[PDB]
């Protein structure tokens, strides 16, 4: 039995301004009684109402999540949130906590590229975006076309790894269609990071021709 507690994505923190944190429990041996899952804050202030979700697994396990909306002033100013899971089959409770990640702050650099035509793929093009040298590692990445954000499942983004220097880096890949760039031949790679200034947003445009 494991427990995980995330931060809010910098998208929900600075774009939506509605940040949430998720407490996750994968169950080793499930099906006993009911699992209790509660929240607390370091400052003693109240916690909003969480949303309780669970889904059974095909490998015989049970997954239980609880999402807690948190303030933006609260998170940035460094509040500590705490999740406490209790199970009738565990001797004592599991507990995880989350807070603003420490360390120096550095803004991301963003570079967007497009691949040339590949014979046998005259109506597909692949776009790439390199975001590097930012810290801390929390970063959100979206692709905008015709000024409407694209479905997040249209692209893939690597988990942040370290540069030679002090920053982190990620890559993002997006296959676009001929119909899309013939409609408007501009795509945006937007990165949301707390150290970016202003509005925590750095972006770059890329074209296919």
């Amino acid at each position: 039995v494991s427990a995980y507690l995330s931060r809010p994505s910098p998208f929900d923190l600075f774009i939506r301004k509605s940040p949430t944190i998720t407490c996750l429990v994968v169950d080793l041996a499930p099906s006993k009684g009911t699992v209790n899952l509660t929240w607390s804050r370091a400052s003693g202030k109240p916690v909003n109402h969480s949303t309780r979700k669970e889904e059974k697994q095909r490998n015989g396990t049970l997954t239980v999540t609880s999402t807690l909306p948190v303030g933006t002033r609260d998170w940035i100013e460094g509040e500590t949130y705490q999740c406490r899971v209790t199970h009738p089959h565990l001797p004592r409770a599991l507990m995880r906590s989350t807070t603003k990640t420490s360390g120096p702050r550095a803004a991301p650099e963003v570079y967007a590229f497009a691949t040339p035509e590949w014979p046998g793929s005259r109506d597909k093009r692949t776009l790439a975006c390199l975001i590097q040298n930012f810290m801390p590692e929390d970063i959100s990445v979206q692709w905008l076309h015709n000024e409407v954000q694209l479905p997040d499942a249209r692209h893939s983004t690597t988990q942040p790894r370290k540069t030679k220097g002090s920053g982190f880096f990620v890559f993002s890949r997006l296959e676009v269609t001929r119909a899309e760039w013939e409609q408007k031949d501009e795509f945006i790679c937007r990165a949301v990071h707390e150290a970016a200034s202003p509005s925590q947003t750095v972006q770059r445009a890329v074209s296919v021709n």
Epitope: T38, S40, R41, A42, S43, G44, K45, R92, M95
Partner: antibody, heavy 121, light 114 residues
């Protein structure tokens, strides 16, 4: 970072009054966290005394209730420990402390230098 | 009167650097609630303010070295210093947060041999 600075301790005769203050800097006591006074007789253990929470909720120790009063000043971001009828047992070093919260129970994570109160003979 | 009394043991101990120290804190009542035990541990180097080490029996306060660990439940709690560093000779207090009024132990003086 949050910082706490006691002041006001010194030599005082029994049955008198003495006011101790804990100047908070780096955080505002109205968005707290609990704020406490904890004392320690010379060479003996620690004893919890009183606490004000961020909304103004006070709590006291039975062993001092009646003759000791906690209060705050949002405009000065200072909270005080009013001591009336100083007894011999009140000779101690008084620390103020910020209590972090954990599911209805509090631990004292940030402390001050402390201040020395001495009750005359 | 009906406070929760905390007895610590040993009340005083001599050790060398690298040694393993085990401090006990026994309580007059159970301090359990909701699957946790609300017993915290503090360190007080001479002449200075206490410092929070562990809270809720076993959770290490941020910035505290990992050689400090907390264990126990109910009325039986133990602080463990796995490898005594030289900056660790101080008095260690336990404190329960289960019910008002919050009470401490009497302290375990950890002194250096010689």
């Amino acid at each position: 970072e949050v910082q706490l600075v006691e002041s006001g301790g010194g030599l005082v005769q029994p049955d008198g009054s003495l006011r101790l203050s804990c100047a908070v800097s780096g955080y505002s006591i109205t968005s707290g966290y609990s704020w406490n006074w904890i004392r320690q007789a010379p060479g003996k253990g620690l004893e919890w005394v009183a606490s004000v929470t961020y909304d103004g909720s006070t709590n006291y120790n039975p062993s001092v209730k009646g003759r000791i009063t906690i209060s705050r000043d949002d405009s000065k971001n200072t909270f005080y420990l009013q001591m009336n009828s100083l007894r011999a047992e009140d000779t101690a070093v008084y620390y103020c402390a910020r209590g972090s919260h954990y599911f209805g129970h509090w631990h004292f994570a940030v402390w001050g230098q402390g201040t020395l109160v001495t009750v005359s003979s | 009167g009906s406070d929760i009394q905390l007895t610590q043991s040993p009340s005083s101990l001599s050790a060398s650097v690298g040694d393993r120290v085990t401090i006990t804190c026994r309580a007059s009542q159970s301090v359990d609630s909701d699957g946790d035990s609300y017993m915290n541990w503090y360190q007080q180097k001479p002449g200075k303010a206490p410092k929070l080490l562990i809270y809720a029996a076993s959770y290490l306060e941020s910035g505290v070295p990992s050689r400090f660990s907390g264990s126990g439940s109910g009325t039986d709690f133990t602080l463990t210093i796995s490898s005594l560093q030289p900056e660790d000779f101080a008095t260690y207090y336990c404190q329960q947060s289960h019910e008002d009024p919050y009470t401490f132990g009497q302290g375990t003086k950890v002194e250096i041999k010689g």
